[model samples]
Target: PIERVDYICERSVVVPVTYIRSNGAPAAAVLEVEGKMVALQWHGDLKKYVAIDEQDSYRWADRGGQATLSHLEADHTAKEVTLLSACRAD
Candidate 1:
């Protein structure tokens, strides 16, 4: 059987990469399989900054983005990239 997925617009949070450590660097750090995911302690209405289109995932956020290392040498690789705004709903 095929699995079905849907996107619900409820109160949610999105963590996106807004900046890169260097120009023309690889976009792989966004998916940290060994990293941790937790709730933030701050809350506010932020604006959109930039957008990156990658083959694997999409990131949307402000000017201040997160720093990540590339995973090109890993067993797998990404063919596309993208970015988007990062915010939560009330």
Candidate 2:
């Protein structure tokens, strides 16, 4: 099972995502959710592996919430993905 961590509002959000490429190269992205999906461009040399073709704008129901980061296809469209820690605001 994927580990879920507590949501903490900080300058940088780091979450682990794992994947395997067609060339047998392992890929992972550490996502940081601030106002958007921020990720470190170092792991697996992802900066050299993946390319951003288009970025779709996203909006949550609230400002701060929980999200999960998981494996995604390493293609031209898959930009760095981030999972924000969400909580019920009531």
Candidate 3:
């Protein structure tokens, strides 16, 4: 599914692009992926971030000590970019 940012609130963190990193706020976060904005909402139950969509619930997993939003498949070499920074826009 295509990930995009709809709305950003305050208390967002910035995920740097130099290397893989993990970042999440209390509830909402936003990032730029290949020029496309990706938004995420915190999952209190799972204690992780998930895509802000019903059908497109992509689990943000921690890989190699970093956050990675990979494809939902058997292949382990997904090319999706890691979350880079987060901000809230009113």
Candidate 4:
């Protein structure tokens, strides 16, 4: 089954979507930021998935009243929180 994780923020979100590709193969992962889709690549050393063209990964954090999405560089270096706010939804 396809799975997705939506990290909701104030006015935006970072969603990691998983699914099978057209050839019956699975994609590493896909990300939706704002309205753009970025494909994720697997990093063996980091043992995780990330974006190569953008050379980035993301970390989501939830505070009491808000959520933060941190922009992660190579080696999991945190650049900054790109978005702010938590998902208040059903």
Candidate 5:
């Protein structure tokens, strides 16, 4: 299981998605929901599976709603995401 921890406004979340990457690298992509949002997929850049749809230039927040996370895959430089299991914390 991949452990992803995000320090939000007095909150946090953990999701493991690296187990579905073809290679361990930073991937770029766009998030589709609540308007088109850009998402990055970073794998093992820091440690384990780290989504890096950005270069420390964007912010992602899972509002902890009834959202559903699905598999991810795409194209473009620093803009390809290969998600295995999308998570939605409720």
Candidate 6:
């Protein structure tokens, strides 16, 4: 199933280059990734910030938009970006 990741908000940063995610809004919360720390946000309204896990898949929350997971690992991995796609319903 193709989930529509349509941009919905306030959104990340003067942090790094080469690897970047769907940083549509602005900086929210900064944290460490690898050995190098930088300014990338994990946005949401869950009171406490989201964490790294398969238990969660990031999604838009505010500013008519969203997505998360501060796991800079995966965010740094989507080489040759793949946008929304679909197939014929069987």
Q: Highest TM-score, which number?
A: 4
Q: Please, what is the TM-score per model?
A: 0.20, 0.22, 0.40, 0.41, 0.24, 0.19
lDDT of 4 by residue, 1-90 (tens): 355555544555545454324345434666666575756654545544456565655533333534444466665554555554455321
Off by over 4 Å in 2: 1-12, 26-32, 35-53, 56-90
Q: What is the per-residue lDDT of model 5 for residues 1-90, given as tens digits with 9 covering 90 to 100?
A: 333332212123334222223355334333433243445453333332223543433322233432223333333345433232244542
- RMSD to the hidden true structure, all candidates: 14.5, 11.6, 11.1, 6.7, 11.5, 15.4
Task: lDDT for model 5, please.
Answer: 0.33
Per-residue CA lDDT of candidate 1, range 1-90, in tens? 121112112233233222223344322222212243211111124232212222222232323333222222212554333321233321
50: Cα error in model 5, Å: 7.5
User: How well is each residue in 1-90 modelled by candidate 3, as lDDT tens digits?
Assistant: 223333232234433221222453345555554354556676668765666764444545433344555333334654444433233322
Q: Give me the runs in candidate 5 sitting further than 4 Å from their true place.
A: 1-20, 23-30, 47-56, 59-90
Worst 10-residue lDDT window for candidate 2 reads 53-62
lDDT at 32, model 4? 66
Clashes by residue pair, model 4? 10-85, 67-85
lDDT of every predicted structure (CA atoms) = 0.25, 0.33, 0.44, 0.50, 0.33, 0.29
Clashing pairs in 3: 14-85, 15-85
Minimal lDDT window, size 10, model 1: 1-10
If candidate 6 were superposed on the true structure by all CA atoms, what would the RMSD be? Answer: 15.4
Stretches of candidate 4 above 4 Å error?
9-16, 19-27, 54-90
Decoy 3 TM-score against native: 0.40
User: In terms of TM-score, how similar is model 1 to the real structure?
Assistant: 0.20
RMSD of 1: 14.5
lDDT of 6 at 80: 28
Error of 4 at 89 (Å): 13
